[PDB]
Structures are given as structure tokens and as C-alpha cells.
Amino acid sequence: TLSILVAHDLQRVIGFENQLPWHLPNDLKHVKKLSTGHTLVMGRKTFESIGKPLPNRRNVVLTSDTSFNVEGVDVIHSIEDIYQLPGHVFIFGGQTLFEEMIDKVDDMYITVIEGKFRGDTFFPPYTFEDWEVASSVEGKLDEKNTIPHTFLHLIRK
Ligand SMILES: NC(=O)C1=CN([C@@H]2O[C@H](COP(=O)(O)OP(=O)(O)OC[C@H]3O[C@@H](n4cnc5c(N)ncnc54)[C@H](OP(=O)(O)O)[C@@H]3O)[C@@H](O)[C@H]2O)C=CC1
Ligand SMILES: CCc1nc(N)nc(N)c1C#CCc1cc(-c2ccccc2)ccc1OC
């Protein structure tokens, strides 16, 4: 199963200056609950923003740099390599990888941030004619999670 894992705002902003424009623990909980014990495929630039690999999951980084070597990280150099990965594979970002993979994924796990932030990286546009809403769940708001958000699970028609 090949799925996109993304969090974008009302205008599909995903990042600003190599990082997330918001901190939302509920979305992090959503990521860990969903990707733990599976595989994350991310672009090279996104990994450098994180620094370390994420624990309890297989971390794959896509890069043209063949000399790439980081502790506890598997390396791939082509978009084709993704299909030769066992189990549930999550496309983790960022922009350029989302742009390439949107047309190829079966599945899509989107956290819609119900706001408008300043950003320089975006998620590709998508119509609901191509995607059916498998589930739409509102996020609960506490003192630590003050930005309204909706968890969407989208499956390709
Ligand atoms: N809100 C969210 O869900 C997320 C947001 N983001 C945000 O997005 C931004 C990152 O976007 P972006 O700058 O596009 O970063 P990316 O991680 O998507 O960059 C991808 C990089 O990997 C390499 N690469 C990508 N595709 C290929 C390919 N097909 N073949 C060979 N190499 C490839 C390229 O560099 P090279 O080959 O030279 O190494 C490229 O620069 C950040 O600002 C971040 O904050 C990121 C993830 C999630
Ligand atoms: C965590 C939001 C996020 N949510 C969703 N629904 N999909 C995603 N693909 C990402 C993402 C990302 C990429 C990303 C993640 C973390 C992070 C922070 C704390 C703990 C674990 C990871 C830090 C920087 C970063 O790049 C800027």
C-alpha cells in the first residue's frame, strides 16, 4: 500500500523556510500512530530539516547524491525504487516529492489545518472528483492544540 502523509493549511501551505509553520501535537500523535512499524519515504531536503531518523519505523531518503550515508537511514536514488519496498509505505514529503507522487499513490492521509499561515512550500492541488472521503474526523482542541484541524483519509476513485 502506497499512501501520502501530509499536513497542509487552507491554502495548501506545507512549510516555511525549511520547516513546519505550526506546532500541533495531535498531528504528531496522528503521524506516530499511523507510521510506526512501517516505512517513511522522504525527500533529501526534508530529512535535513528533521536531522535524525524517526524511531520505530523504516526511514528511506530519496536523493541523487550516491554518497549519501546516515546512521539508520536507507537510501534510494530513483522514483522507481519506491515500488520495490515491502509493507505500508508512506510518502512523507516534502513539496517536490508530493508533486511527483500524488498521481501514483493509492491512498492519502491529510491533516487539514483550518487556518492560513505564511509559507514557501505547498501541497499540489487536488479535486474531490478523483478522491473519495473514506473518513473525515475533527481534531480535539486543548491548551496544547489550539489550531482547528481535520483528519482526512482519501482513497483514489
Ligand atoms: N506539512 C507537511 O506534511 C510537510 C511539510 N514539509 C515542508 O516542505 C518543505 C520541503 O519541500 P522540498 O524543498 O521540496 O523538499 P524535499 O524533501 O521534497 O526535497 C526533495 C529533494 O530530494 C531529492 N529528490 C527528490 N526527488 C528526486 C528524484 N525523483 N530523483 C532523485 N532525487 C530526488 C532532491 O535533492 P537531491 O537529489 O539533490 O538530494 C530534492 O531536492 C519544507 O519546507 C518542509 O517544511 C515537508 C514534509 C512534510
Ligand atoms: C509532523 C508533521 C507532519 N504531519 C503530517 N500529517 N504529515 C507529514 N508528512 C508531516 C511531516 C513532516 C516533516 C517534519 C517532521 C518533523 C517532526 C517533528 C516532530 C516529530 C516528528 C517529526 C520535523 C520537521 C519536519 O520537516 C519540516
Side-chain angles (χ1 to χ4, degrees), residues 5-7 18-20 27-28 31 46 49-50 54 92 98 111:
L5 181 50
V6 66
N18 292 307
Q19 47 204 342
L20 310 160
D27 185 43
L28 308 171
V31 167
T46 300
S49 181
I50 310 161
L54 297 185
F92 206 56
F98 283 139
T111 307

Side-chain angles (χ1 to χ4, degrees), residues 87-143:
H88 204 142
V89 180
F90 290 96
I91 304 300
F92 206 56
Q95 187 197 74
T96 53
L97 189 68
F98 283 139
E99 286 166 351
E100 294 168 301
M101 292 308 287
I102 184 155
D103 233 296
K104 300 162 188 294
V105 290
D106 331 296
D107 215 11
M108 215 142 75
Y109 290 93
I110 301 169
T111 307
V112 174
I113 308 299
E114 310 288 339
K116 304 199 285 180
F117 293 76
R118 176 178 284 103
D120 49 38
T121 58
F122 283 76
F123 190 74
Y126 58 97
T127 63
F128 285 106
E129 328 279 14
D130 301 13
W131 302 87
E132 66 171 308
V133 189
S135 72
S136 177
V137 181
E138 275 192 32
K140 296 310 288 291
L141 302 167
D142 49 61
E143 297 96 64

Side-chain angles (χ1 to χ4, degrees), residues 56-71:
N56 309 112
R57 44 211 142 171
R58 212 264 268 251
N59 286 228
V60 181
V61 170
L62 214 171
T63 175
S64 63
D65 184 352
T66 46
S67 70
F68 196 89
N69 175 255
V70 180
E71 204 88 308

Side-chain angles (χ1 to χ4, degrees), residues 66-79:
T66 46
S67 70
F68 196 89
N69 175 255
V70 180
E71 204 88 308
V73 173
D74 288 301
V75 193
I76 59 165
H77 312 280
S78 302
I79 205 86

